[PDB]
């Protein structure tokens, strides 16, 4: 059994949202206890819904779980903004316990902003090493959401790629910074490189030419 | 108010033991189930055991069956994990549950990997750069440390705005951190920038000035 959630929903304060919860091997039941909890900044976990229904002690009743279609939901009704987390799901299959992958939730505090990428090149005194470590930095973006893709020469750099996952900044921003590693030797039969940054469906593209 | 804290969690290396410890408060661990779940570097949620109350079952994931034993101390409220022959993707921030996940303790990290190193810092200049909105952009890569953690500063506090530090990295038993500053082109190379990183573990101090490519 696989369990798959939504993977980023953003609401602005004071509507109502919905997550979901879907099982691969069928439609979720009761017997599934379903289970809710958030997850906030500083790796922070607490417990919202269990047992399908139930609200854990504490929880604001905005938090509403329930089934409905053949999934498990989870109803934020008028969602403020200390409500952005992570949400995950759990489900017990009377044996074990599956997670589901989270759902990224954004409360728009401010308006969408894009990223400020930034690609560098690899240092002399790195390739002397032997190595090639092209940085890519991305930040001021919000929501915290980023997709990075990296070509070498037009063709997609299917490996070597290392990607931080975003933080948050004093601006309530967020940040992130992808890697790409090569060798001397690789970096040298190579002279586009490029480091592609797609927020909120727009793909901003920061390039550099070896040679 | 009840109370879970975790404790245990240290480097160790493939193949290496560990046994971690979840210190109960608040309520008395027999008669509650009670679980150890993982998060990743992946920044995912996995269930690892669970041990039901009475004296019921325990129930262990598919990626954890038969290298790790759970263990209840009921006498010091205190519920064990056993991890023994570890591997690259045991390496996580391990936290141990209430029934139904209603609590969680802080979470202890452990990181299955080779050994301790001083950092190898990079300047990053831009490469026979531009300035849009006349602000230049420069950086530091420390690369192949361990342990975590390492502190970057840039000329020692005097920038402090437009600097982005950004989270470790693990590849191949070795952590690789960033970190920048933005300045404006009156600055920089007019004046000096120098990212200073200092590595606790090893106590290792370096100082690198950022000068053009
Ligand atoms: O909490 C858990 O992790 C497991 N929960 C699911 C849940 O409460 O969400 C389920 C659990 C009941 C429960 C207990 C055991 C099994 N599996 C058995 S008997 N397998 C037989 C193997 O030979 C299934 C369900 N609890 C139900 C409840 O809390 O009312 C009682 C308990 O936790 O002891
Ligand atoms: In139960």
């Known amino acids: 059994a696989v369990v798959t959630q939504e993977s980023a929903l953003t609401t602005s304060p004071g509507e109502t949202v919905t997550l979901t919860c879907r099982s691969s091997?069928?439609?979720?039941?009761?017997?599934?206890?379903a289970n809710w909890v958030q997850e906030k900044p500083d790796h922070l976990f607490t417990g919202l819904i269990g047992?399908?229904?139930n609200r854990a002690p504490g929880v604001p009743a905005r938090f509403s779980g329930s089934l409905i279609g053949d999934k498990a939901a989870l109803t934020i009704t008028g969602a403020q903004t200390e409500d952005e987390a992570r949400y995950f799901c759990?489900?017990?299959?009377?044996?074990?316990?599956?997670f589901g992958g989270g759902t990224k939730l954004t409360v728009l505090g401010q308006p969408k902003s894009s990223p400020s990428v930034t690609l560098f090149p690899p240092s002399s005194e790195e390739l002397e090493t032997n190595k090639a470590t092209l940085v890519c930095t991305i930040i001021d973006f919000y929501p915290g959401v980023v997709t990075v893709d990296w070509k070498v020469d037009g063709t997609p750099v299917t490996q070597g790629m290392e990607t931080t996952q975003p933080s948050k900044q004093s601006n309530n921003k967020y940040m992130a910074s992808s890697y790409l590693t090569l060798t001397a030797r690789e970096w040298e039969r190579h002279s586009s490189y490029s480091c592609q940054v797609t927020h909120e469906g727009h793909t901003v593209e920061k390039s550099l030419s070896r040679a | 108010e009840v109370t879970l804290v975790e404790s245990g969690g240290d480097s160790v290396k493939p193949g290496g033991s560990l046994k971690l410890s979840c210190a109960a408060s608040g309520f008395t661990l027999s008669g509650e189930t009670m679980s150890w779940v993982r998060q990743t570097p992946e920044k995912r949620l996995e269930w690892v055991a669970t041990?039901?109350?009475?004296?019921?079952?325990?129930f262990y994931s598919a990626s954890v069956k038969g290298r790790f034993t759970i263990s209840r101390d009921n006498a010091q409220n205190n519920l064990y994990l056993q991890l023994n022959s570890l591997r690259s993707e045991d390496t996580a921030l391990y936290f141990c549950?209430?029934?139904?996940?209603?609590?969680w303790g802080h979470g202890t990290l452990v990181t299955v990997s080779a050994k301790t190193t001083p950092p190898s810092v990079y300047p990053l200049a831009p490469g026979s750069a531009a300035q849009t909105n006349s602000m230049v952009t420069l950086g530091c890569l420390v690369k192949g440390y361990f342990p975590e953690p390492v502190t970057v500063t840039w000329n020692s506090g005097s920038l402090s705005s437009g600097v982005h530090t950004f989270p470790a990295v693990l590849e191949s038993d070795l952590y690789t951190l960033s970190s920048s500053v933005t300045v404006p082109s009156s600055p920089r190379p007019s004046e000096t920038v120098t990212c200073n990183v200092a590595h606790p573990a090893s106590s290792t101090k370096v100082d690198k000035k950022i000068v053009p490519r």
């Open positions: 047992g399908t229904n």
């Open positions: 549950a209430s029934h139904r996940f209603v609590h």
């Open positions: 759990a489900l017990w299959y009377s044996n074990l316990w599956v």
């Open positions: 041990t039901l109350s009475g004296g019921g079952f325990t």
């Open positions: 091997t069928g439609a979720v039941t009761t017997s599934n206890y």
